[PDB]
Amino acid sequence: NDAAVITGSDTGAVTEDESTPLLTETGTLSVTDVDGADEAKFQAGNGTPSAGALGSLTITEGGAWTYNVDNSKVQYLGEGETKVETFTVASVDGTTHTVTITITGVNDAAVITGSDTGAVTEDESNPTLTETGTLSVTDVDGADEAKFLAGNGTPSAGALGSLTITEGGAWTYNVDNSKVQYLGEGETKVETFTVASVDGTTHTVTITITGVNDAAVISGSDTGAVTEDESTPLLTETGTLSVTDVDGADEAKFLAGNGVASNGALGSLTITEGGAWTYNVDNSKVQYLGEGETKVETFTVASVDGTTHTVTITITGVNDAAVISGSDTGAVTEDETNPLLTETGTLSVTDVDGADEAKFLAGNGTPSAGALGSLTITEGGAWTYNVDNSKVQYLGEGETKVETFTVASVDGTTHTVTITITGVN
Ligand SMILES: [Ca+2]
Ligand SMILES: [Ca+2]
Ligand SMILES: [Ca+2]
Ligand SMILES: [Ca+2]
Ligand SMILES: [Ca+2]
Ligand SMILES: [Ca+2]
Ligand SMILES: [Ca+2]
Ligand SMILES: [Ca+2]
Ligand SMILES: [Ca+2]
Ligand SMILES: [Ca+2]
Ligand SMILES: [Ca+2]
Ligand SMILES: [Ca+2]
Ligand SMILES: [Ca+2]
Ligand SMILES: [Cl-]
Ligand code: NA
């Protein structure tokens, strides 16, 4: 027996996903046999596969071979990855030939799932705000590709924080708490970070930062003073508060209107958006305060976000002169008694500065120049004048001598008692 000569197309190629559901390749082999044309033909049927062939090859008597493989079975091949399969065909005689099929893989996108959102709040921790989560990845091109590229996610424009992921998919977002202070209550900033699997398939993690209120910082003039009777009918005090607010210029101003007064305040205070305050009180309401006596009134004002500050006003009293009345005159007549001529009367005092000032300094009245007599007064206002009858004898019938005595209330207010001495023969 002489071996057939088998020639023609004995190689073929299919690419993953070139067609569906089958990848198919064809070729024709030709056979000549020197033992005659009954031998110069192929055994029709399946070629004998290499071990671990996924595809199959059939050949006709005429040498027309077809390779078929399920596209589903070659998905695991990565971009450019080759699998070579061989099939043995034979002459009617038994002379063998091999057909060589190459399968070439294409990339399959990774499938990325799991936690791809997170949230941090201003001041939840310090100095760093942290969020964590886990992505997971599958990739039909194999365990080699079913992994993240470890490192930083590519940040959105103007992101404050950063995100790192591990090969297993564990991500960590961190932002400096100092950098998010400027966000107001419930205000949000969204930052995104793009991560990648080995084959360059991307997924986004979206992080929402939420702000909390920062208390305004109020400073400037928060104290003021008025003095009774410095002006009328109002006593007025002004000052300017300043405010900053890290939550922004929207918040760095005052709520215009009245300050909330301390209970028992006699005055009132208004403030402008720009922090200019004005305290007013009716002068008539503070008369009752005595010299140097104080009354402190406080007014609560607020910034836009409700941060409060106190303005403290001190009212200082001044003396009101006592009103002195009652019996401030008296009379004695030469020889009416002996050896003293005596006269009594009672003064009264009332004082706007209070019942505490409604009394006299007890003691001697300050005598007029050349006074013969003298006068004492009690704390209650009862006075007593005495003169020696011997010293008034010189006065003629109906001739008078007027003597005056200055007394004082406890606040220093003076009053005169006037005594008339009348002469006889
Ligand atoms: Ca032969
Ligand atoms: Ca593939
Ligand atoms: Ca892949
Ligand atoms: Ca594929
Ligand atoms: Ca969180
Ligand atoms: Ca804030
Ligand atoms: Ca803050
Ligand atoms: Ca604020
Ligand atoms: Ca007064
Ligand atoms: Ca007064
Ligand atoms: Ca007084
Ligand atoms: Ca008083
Ligand atoms: Ca006389
Ligand atoms: Cl597919
Ligand atoms: Na703001």
Numbering used by the authors: 22 to 446
Give verbatim lines from the article.
RTX adhesins are long, multi-domain proteins present on the outer membrane of many Gram-negative bacteria. To expand the reach of the ligand-binding domains, RTX adhesins maintain a central extender region of multiple tandem repeats, which makes up most of the proteins’ large molecular weight. In this study, we analyzed extender regions from two additional RTX adhesins, including the long adhesion proteins from Marinobacter hydrocarbonoclasticus (MhLap) – an oil-eating marine bacterium – and Aeromonas hydrophila (AhLap) – an opportunistic pathogen of fish and mammals. However, all the tetra-tandemers have at least one calcium ion coordinated in the linker region between beta-sandwich domains whose role appears to be the rigidification of the extender region to help the adhesin extend its reach.
Calcium SAD phasing was used to solve the tetra-tandemer structures to 2.0 Å (MhLap) and 1.75 Å resolution (AhLap). The repeats are rotated relative to each other around the long central axis, producing a handedness to the tetra-tandemers reminiscent of helices. Both the MhLap and AhLap structures show right-handed rotations, with pitches of approximately i + 3 and i + 2, respectively. Alternatively, the AhLap repeats possess a more involved connectivity, resulting in 50 Å-long beta sandwiches that are held together by one four-stranded and another five-stranded beta sheet. The AhLap tetra-tandemer coordinates many more calcium ions throughout its length than does MhLap, although the number of ions per repeat is inconsistent. Each inter-domain interface contains, at minimum, three highly coordinated Ca2+, labelled as calciums I, II, and III. Both calciums II and III have pentagonal bipyramid coordination spheres, comprised of seven protein-based ligands each. The three Ca2+ are all coordinated by a combination of Asp, Asn, and Glu sidechains that are conserved in every repeat of the full-length adhesin (except the Glu in position 7, which is a comparable Gln for five repeats), as well as backbone carbonyl groups. Interestingly, several acidic residues (namely ligands 3, 6) use their bidentate sidechains to coordinate two separate calcium ions at the same time, making calciums I, II and III part of an interconnected coordination network. The AhLap structure was solved with two tetra-tandemers in the asymmetric unit, meaning that the structure holds eight repeat domains with six replicate interfaces between them. In fact, the AhLap tetra-tandemer appears more rigid than the MhLap, with both angles remaining closer to the start angle over the entirety of the run.
